[PDB]
Amino acid sequence: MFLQRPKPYSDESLESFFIRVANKNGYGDVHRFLEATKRFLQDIDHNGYQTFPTDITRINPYSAKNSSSARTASFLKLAQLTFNEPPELLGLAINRTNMKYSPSTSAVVRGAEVFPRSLLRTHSIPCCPLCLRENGYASYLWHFQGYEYCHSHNVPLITTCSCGKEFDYRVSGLKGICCKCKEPITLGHEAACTVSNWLAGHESKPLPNLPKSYRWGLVHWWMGIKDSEFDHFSFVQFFSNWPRSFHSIIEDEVEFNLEHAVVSTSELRLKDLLGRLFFGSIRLPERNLQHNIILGELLCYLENRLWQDKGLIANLKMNALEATVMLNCSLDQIASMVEQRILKPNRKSKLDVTDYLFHFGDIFCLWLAEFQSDEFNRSFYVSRW
Amino acid sequence: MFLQRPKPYSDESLESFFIRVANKNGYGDVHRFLEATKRFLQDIDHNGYQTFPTDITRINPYSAKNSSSARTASFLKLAQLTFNEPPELLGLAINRTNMKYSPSTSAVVRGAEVFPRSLLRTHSIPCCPLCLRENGYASYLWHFQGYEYCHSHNVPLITTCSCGKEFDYRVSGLKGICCKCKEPITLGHEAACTVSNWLAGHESKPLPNLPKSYRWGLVHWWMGIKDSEFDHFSFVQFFSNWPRSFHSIIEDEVEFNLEHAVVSTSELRLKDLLGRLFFGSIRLPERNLQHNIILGELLCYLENRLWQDKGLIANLKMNALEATVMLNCSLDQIASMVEQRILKPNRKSKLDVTDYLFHFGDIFCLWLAEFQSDEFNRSFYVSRW
Ligand SMILES: [Zn+2]
Ligand SMILES: [Zn+2]
Ligand SMILES: [Zn+2]
Ligand SMILES: [Zn+2]
């Protein structure tokens, strides 16, 4: 097997790249190519040929169950061996990552770009028929919810043929022809266009100029705020009023929960007053306060309200689990700060990972004294007050 | 207690700030001020007054043994309460952090700037007498080895009076008068000036324009390479020849260790061929490959030599401990990748945290498939090849 590389595009999906490789190298379709590629890897005894996928919908390493590192080893070998000139193959693939988006969503990565798993499309993947016909390849952005309009042609992406059959370019090809009726697939909220342009990485006021992974983070965050599908209109609205618009969400959240508080003030946990908002904002995907503007604003608000109302904020209860996520440290690290005299529990008996033994004020001052990094530190939000 | 804030300087040491506060608010010296400050905190019953320091050499939170978070709570309260206008106090303090510089050095942080603990001066702290007399305050940079020349006056910092008594501005004051002989303290390698200027944060060719924490990281790294005090001349030399100068260090390291190899090739561990260099370079202080240019070059070299010599590099042995530092993951995470079928050990019995069960090639492909972040990823070094 020896292949001509197609014209490289840095925004091409991995599936589109393989489709073009198949088309331009005389294979009948991508499936025949993937089967021939698996046979090639078997003929050179590359460990991992057994799990090489022949289903174009399962090609990315995130789709591998147990063989994700055999998959990346395979792409590396193919890149380094089977082309006249080596293509960028690994850089187009969507891999799993270790990162999380708060509170508990997993994530994936392509190149240097991290995405919440909640945004990774599970079923049919849409397309822009204008992009396919004019460019001859598919964008990786079509794999991710939130990107609902083509930022270059300013029209909504298309999911289904007018005949009713869903059009997935991965299965039906880059020519944009419906598999069932054999007709060419054929086609304006500016807010949708604004956030699509922003997601693509371009300046789009009033949305903030953050690294790409944190833009996807804000989409995930907004979804959680509303507990529903991403609403482009209220998102743009929100940022057109930033940061006051967020100061109102915080204040309104505290005042509602404090009033609906049925337990004693001394028994109030941080989760009871600011649960959703605080623990939903810590990793978007990380705690870099130049980039995680939600956490920066929240922490600036909390430092400056710390000791008001005889320590309302400072006294809010937390457990060891919550402190570890706050501080980005291990439970074992927490135990060592409590057995020594650095972290002091409220109830002085003589560590339940889950009992609410600590006070926000103590954990906050512990962060300052022991857990600031070059990215996650007070100096990056003091200008927000 | 009510105080006038001194003229703020963003580069002032915490000790110098307190000295000026004492001088300008009628206290006899800084010690009397710190004692009065401790009495003030006791009069308002601030928890932490008992550990408030009265030794100017022990004022930073890093000098607290068990009370570092009482110390930051104290600074916060003092800032928010005892001045006509609130000063930036916390931002001048040197705190401990959780970060490490490879292989096992601890770190501290001031503002957003992280430093290796190995550079934090333990004994007498030097000064520039020109800075003291012209500016009336001391720079925080004087606390850190590597910064041996004043970058603004282009002269070496001074440690001891001509009479022999060491001059520590913290104890002897900002007036630059020797405590023993009562004489004013009185005073040219351009490489020293170059790296001093670079450490201060300014452009200084041929040294690389990285965030400050990674500049201190390179000083720590160079010290380890030579196993001795920082040598400004060979450091500048090294970077005047970058990156070829590092390609030579790698190649020379591999060829020496491979030749001095007494064990069988199949038994070669990664540590045996590239021990010092690889595990000395992972966290400087982190794995961001835009900033940790040592790790980026090393990983680019390793990916592209992976499968040469019938997998010399790929076959190098590693244990679970080494993989966790490589991958930035937990030992428990490693166990879950081996009990599942993602990470495959070499010897197939049926996890010793220390046995060399894994191959570099497997761990490297696992990093790609499962552990790339927005900062620690292949796309940030492919341009180095
Ligand atoms: Zn389009
Ligand atoms: Zn149709
Ligand atoms: Zn000077
Ligand atoms: Zn003297």
XYZ file of C-alpha atoms and ligand atoms in Angstrom, chain B residues 128-132 142 150-153 155 157, ligand 3:
13
model
C 21.608 46.625 45.426
C 22.685 49.737 47.371
C 21.829 51.919 44.371
C 18.253 50.610 44.302
C 17.865 51.134 48.078
C 16.928 39.684 45.629
C 20.831 44.311 39.448
C 19.250 44.483 35.997
C 18.683 48.238 36.285
C 22.108 49.372 37.512
C 26.287 45.816 38.882
C 24.283 42.623 44.149
Zn 19.989 48.479 41.546
